[PDB]
Amino acid sequence: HMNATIREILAKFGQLPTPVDTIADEADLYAAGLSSFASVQLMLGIEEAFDIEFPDNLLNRKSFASIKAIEDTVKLI
Amino acid sequence: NATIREILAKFGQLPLYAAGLSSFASVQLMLGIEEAFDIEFPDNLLNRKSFASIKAIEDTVKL
Amino acid sequence: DPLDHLADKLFHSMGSDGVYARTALYESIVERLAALITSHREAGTEALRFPPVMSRAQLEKSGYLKSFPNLLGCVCGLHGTEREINAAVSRFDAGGDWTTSLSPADLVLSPAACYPVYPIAASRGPLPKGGLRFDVAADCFRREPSKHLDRLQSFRMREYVCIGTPDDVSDFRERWMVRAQAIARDLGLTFRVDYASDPFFGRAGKMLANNQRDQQLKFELLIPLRSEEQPTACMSFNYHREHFGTTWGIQDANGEPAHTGCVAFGMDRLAVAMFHTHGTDLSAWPAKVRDILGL
Amino acid sequence: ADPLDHLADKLFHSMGSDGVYARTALYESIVERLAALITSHREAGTEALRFPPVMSRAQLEKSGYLKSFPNLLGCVCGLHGTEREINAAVSRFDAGGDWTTSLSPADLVLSPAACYPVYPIAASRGPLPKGGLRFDVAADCFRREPSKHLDRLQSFRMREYVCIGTPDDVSDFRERWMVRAQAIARDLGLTFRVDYASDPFFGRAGKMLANNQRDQQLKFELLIPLRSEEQPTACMSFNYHREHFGTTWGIQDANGEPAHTGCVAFGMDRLAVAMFHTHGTDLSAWPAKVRDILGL
Ligand SMILES: Nc1ncnc2c1ncn2[C@@H]1O[C@H](COP(=O)(O)OP(=O)(O)OP(=O)(O)O)[C@@H](O)[C@H]1O
Numbered sequence: 072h073m074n075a076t077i078r079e080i081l082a083k084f085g086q087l088p089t090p091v092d093t094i095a096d097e098a099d100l101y102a103a104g105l106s107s108f109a110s111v112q113l114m115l116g117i118e119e120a121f122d123i124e125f126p127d128n129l130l131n132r133k134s135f136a137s138i139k140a141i142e143d144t145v146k147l148i
Numbered sequence: 149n150a151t152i153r154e155i156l157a158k159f160g161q162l163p164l165y166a167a168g169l170s171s172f173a174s175v176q177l178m179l180g181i182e183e184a185f186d187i188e189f190p191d192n193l194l195n196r197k198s199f200a201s202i203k204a205i206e207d208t209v210k211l
Numbered sequence: 212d213p214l215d216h217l218a219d220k221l222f223h224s225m226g227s228d229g230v231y232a233r234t235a236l237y238e239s240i241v242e243r244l245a246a247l248i249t250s251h252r253e254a255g256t257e258a259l260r261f262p263p264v265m266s267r268a269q270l271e272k273s274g275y276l277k278s279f280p281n282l283l284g285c286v287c288g289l290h291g292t293e294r295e296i297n298a299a300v301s302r303f304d305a306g307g308d309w310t311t312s313l314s315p316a317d318l319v320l321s322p323a324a325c326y327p328v329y330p331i332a333a334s335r336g337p338l339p340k341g342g343l344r345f346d347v348a349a350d351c352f353r354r355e356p357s358k359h360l361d362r363l364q365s366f367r368m369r370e371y372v373c374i375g376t377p378d379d380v381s382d383f384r385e386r387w388m389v390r391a392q393a394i395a396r397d398l399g400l401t402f403r404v405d406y407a408s409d410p411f412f413g414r415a416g417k418m419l420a421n422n423q424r425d426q427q428l429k430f431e432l433l434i435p436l437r438s439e440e441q442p443t444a445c446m447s448f449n450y451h452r453e454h455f456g457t458t459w460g461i462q463d464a465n466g467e468p469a470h471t472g473c474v475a476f477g478m479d480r481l482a483v484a485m486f487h488t489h490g491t492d493l494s495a496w497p498a499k500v501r502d503i504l505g506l
Numbered sequence: 507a508d509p510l511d512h513l514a515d516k517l518f519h520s521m522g523s524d525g526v527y528a529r530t531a532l533y534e535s536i537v538e539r540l541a542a543l544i545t546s547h548r549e550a551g552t553e554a555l556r557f558p559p560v561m562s563r564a565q566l567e568k569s570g571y572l573k574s575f576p577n578l579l580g581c582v583c584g585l586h587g588t589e590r591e592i593n594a595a596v597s598r599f600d601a602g603g604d605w606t607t608s609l610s611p612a613d614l615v616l617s618p619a620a621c622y623p624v625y626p627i628a629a630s631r632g633p634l635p636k637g638g639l640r641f642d643v644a645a646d647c648f649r650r651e652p653s654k655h656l657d658r659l660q661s662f663r664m665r666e667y668v669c670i671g672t673p674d675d676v677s678d679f680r681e682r683w684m685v686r687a688q689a690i691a692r693d694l695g696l697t698f699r700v701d702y703a704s705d706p707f708f709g710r711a712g713k714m715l716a717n718n719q720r721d722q723q724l725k726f727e728l729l730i731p732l733r734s735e736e737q738p739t740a741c742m743s744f745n746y747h748r749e750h751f752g753t754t755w756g757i758q759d760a761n762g763e764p765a766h767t768g769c770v771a772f773g774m775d776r777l778a779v780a781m782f783h784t785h786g787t788d789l790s791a792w793p794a795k796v797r798d799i800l801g802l
C-alpha cells in the first residue's frame with residue numbers, strides 16, 4: 072500500500088511527462104522527468120501523505136532517485 | 149480675530165515671521181483657516197505675504 | 212517624443228517604465244560627466260558615497276513626508292517565521308497574493324543624495340568657520356513611472372552641499388550658479404536658468420511651491436530635450452535656509468542654526484542631454500566637447 | 507571583538523542602520539581600483555550592462571526567487587492612494603501612529619543579485635549563436651540580512667561575468683574564471699581557499715536544495731579569513747545553474763536545446779574590506795606589487 076501512496080504523491084507533486092502508471096519501482100526518476108524543484112515538492116508531498124520528516128542525511132537526490140529508493144528510505148525511517 | 153487667536157496657538161508653534169512662525173508651520177496655519185472657516189484659498193492669495201501678521205490674515209478672509 | 216530614438220543605443224528594457232539597463236556607450240558618458248564634475252570640485256570638500264537605501268527614521272525626521280509622500284519608495288519584506296513566510300509563498304504558488312504579508316523595514320530608497328549628510332555633519336559638533344562642504348552621490352528613487360527617457364524612477368544624483376552661515380551658503384550658491392552654467396556651456400549644451408519649485412504634494416504643497424518660487428530658493432538649468440517649451444531640469448540649486456540646520460541641530464561657528472544649500476547634477480538627465488544634443492556617435496562629437504570630456 | 511570593527515573609522519560613516527554605511531573617499535578609491543582590475547581581465551566578446559538597484563518584481567517572481575530566498579527579498583512599496591488617504595497617513599504619523607499602514611506594493615523589488623535582469627534580455631534576441639553569449643554585469647544589490655559585521659551588508663555592490671550557452675560553453679567558462687580569479691586574488695596579496703558551497707536556500711525545502719547543490723558542485727566560493735580563519739568570508743562565487751534559467755526564460759542554445767547558464771560573482775564591498783583588513787588603511791604602506799597591480 073505504501074508503494075501505491077508514494078505513487079499517488081508522485082502524480083500529486085511530480086510534474087512527470089509519462090504517468091506514474093508507466094514507471095517502474097527501480098526506474099530512475101530524474102533519468103526521466105523528475106526536476107529539482109519538483110523533487111523537493113515530492114519530498115514535501117511524501118511528508119504530507121504520511122506524517123514524517125527525513126534526516127538531513129537523506130535529504131538528497133539519492134533518496135528520491137526511484138520509487139523503490141523512496142519506499143526503502145521511508146521504511147528505514 | 150477670536151477664531152484666529154486659537155488657530156495660531158494650535159498650529160503656529162511660536163515661542164508673525166519675526167516670531168517662530170516657520171514655513172511648515174505657516175502651511176499648517178493656512179490649513180487651519182480652511183478648517184475654522186468654510187473656504188479654501190486661491191493659489192493667488194496663497195503665499196508668504198498673506199500670512200505676515202495677525203491683521204494680515206483677517207483681511208484676506210473677508211476677501 | 213524626440214528622445215525615444217536614443218533608446219536603442221543607450222538602454223535595454225527591464226520590463227518597467229523608467230527602469231533601464233544601461234549600455235556600455237551610455238555608461239561611458241555617465242562616467243566622463245562624473246569625472247568632469249569632480250574636476251570642478253571646490254577646495255576643502257569631503258566626498259561621501261551613499262548606497263541606494265537610507266534610514267526610514269532619518270527620512271521621517273527630515274520632513275520628507277510633509278513634502279513628497281507620494282514619491283517615496285519604502286523597503287518592505289517578509290518578516291515572519293518559516294511557516295508564516297511559507298504561507299505567503301504558498302499563496303503565490305496557489306495563484307493568490309503573497310504581497311499581503313509584506314511589512315515595512317527600517318529602510319527607504321533614497322529620494323535624493325543629500326539627506327544622509329546632515330546627521331553626519333551634526334555628529335561632529337559645531338561647524339568650523341567657513342562651514343563644511345560635501346561631495347555626495349547616490350542612486351535615487353522616485354515613484355513616477357514614465358516612458359520618457361528624461362523621467363526615470365531610478366536615477367543617479369551628484370551633489371555639492373554647503374553647510375554653514377547664511378553668507379557661507381550664499382557665497383557657495385553664487386559660485387555654483389556660475390560653475391554649473393560654465394559646465395553646461397563646455398559640454399556644448401543649450402540651456403536657460405530659471406527659478407523653479409520642488410514638486411511638493413497637496414494643497415499645502417501649493418503654498419510651499421509658491422513660497423519657494425517667490426523667495427527664489429530654487430534655480431534650475433533647463434535643457435530642451437522633448438521640446439523648447441517644456442525643457443528638462445538637468446541641474447539645480449536649492450537654498451534650504453536653516454531648515455536642515457534646525458532639524459538636525461547643526462550649529463554654525465556663531466552658535467546659530469546652520470544654513471544649507473546644494474547644487475545637484477542629474478547624471479542620467481545630463482547623459483541623455485549629451486546624446487540628444489550630440490548624437491550616439493562619439494567620434495563625431497565636437498572637438499572641444501571631446502577634449503573637455505577627455506575623449 | 508571582530509577584527510574588522512576598527513576598519514570602520516577610515517572606511518565608513520554610520521547611516522543609522524546596520525549594514526548600510528556611507529563610504530569614505532579612501533574606501534571608494536579602492537572599490538574603483540578593484541573594479542578596474544576586474545575590467546582589465548574581461549574576455550573578448552563580452553557585453554557590458556549596468557543595472558539600477560531595482561528590477562521588475564514580475565521578472566524576479568518568474569526567476570523563482572520567492573521559492574528560494576523569500577526571507578531575503580526587499581520589495582518596493584509606496585503610498586499609492588488618494589490625496590486624502592495619503593494626507594491621513596501622514597497625519598497619523600504626526601499623532602504618534604504608523605503611516606506605513608497606507609503602503610502598497612509597487613511592481614519593483616530591490617535587486618538581490620546582479621545577473622537576474624540579464625536572462626530576459628538575452629532571451630529577447632532569439633537563439634544563441636555558437637559559443638553562446640557572455641555579459642559583464644553590475645548592480646547595487648540588496649538582501650535583508652541586518653548585521654553589525656563589516657563583511658555582511660544589506661546594500662552591497664556586485665560585479666558578475668555571466669555565460670549563457672551549451673553545457674560545455676558554460677563549464678569551460680566557469681573553469682577559466684576559477685583559475686583567473688584565484689590568480690587575481692594572489693596578485694592582490696590575499697589569503698584564501700576555494701571550496702564547494704551552497705546558496706542560503708530557505709526552510710526545509712531549502713536544506714534539500716542546498717544538499718544537492720553542494721553535492722553536484724554547482725557553486726564554488728573563494729573564501730578569505732576576515733573575522734577568523736575558521737569562519738572565512740566568501741568574496742567571490744562561481745555558479746553553475748544548469749538549464750534552470752535557460753528553461754525559465756526559454757533561451758535556446760545553437761543546437762536548439764534549453765541553454766545552460768553560469769556566473770562568476772565578485773563581492774566588491776567584501777573584496778575591498780578584505781584588502782583593507784589584509785594590508786591596512788594606509789595605501790602608501792601597501793606592498794609595492796599590490797600597488798602596481800592596482801595602478802596606485
Ligand atoms: N525623474 C527623474 N529622472 C531623472 N533625473 C531626475 C529625476 N528627478 C530629478 N532628477 C534630477 O535630479 C535632480 C533632483 O532635484 P529635484 O528634486 O529638483 O527634482 P525636479 O527636477 O524638481 O523634478 P521633476 O522634473 O520630476 O518635476 C534634478 O536636478 C534632475 O536633474
Ligand SMILES: Nc1ncnc2c1ncn2[C@@H]1O[C@H](COP(=O)(O)OP(=O)(O)OP(=O)(O)O)[C@@H](O)[C@H]1O
Pocket residue numbers: 619649651657658659660662664704705706727740741742743771772773774775776777
Ligand atoms: N550580505 C552581503 N554583504 C556583502 N557582500 C555580500 C553579501 N552577500 C553576498 N555578498 C558578496 O556577493 C557575492 C554574492 O554571490 P552569492 O549569492 O554567491 O552570495 P553568498 O555567497 O550566498 O553568501 P553568504 O553566505 O556570505 O551570505 C558573494 O560572493 C559575496 O562576495
Ligand SMILES: [Mg+2]
Pocket residue numbers: 431444445446447
Ligand atoms: Mg530640478
Ligand SMILES: [Zn+2]
Pocket residue numbers: 323324325326370449473475
Ligand atoms: Zn540636496
Ligand SMILES: [Zn+2]
Pocket residue numbers: 619620621622666745769770771
Ligand atoms: Zn549571478
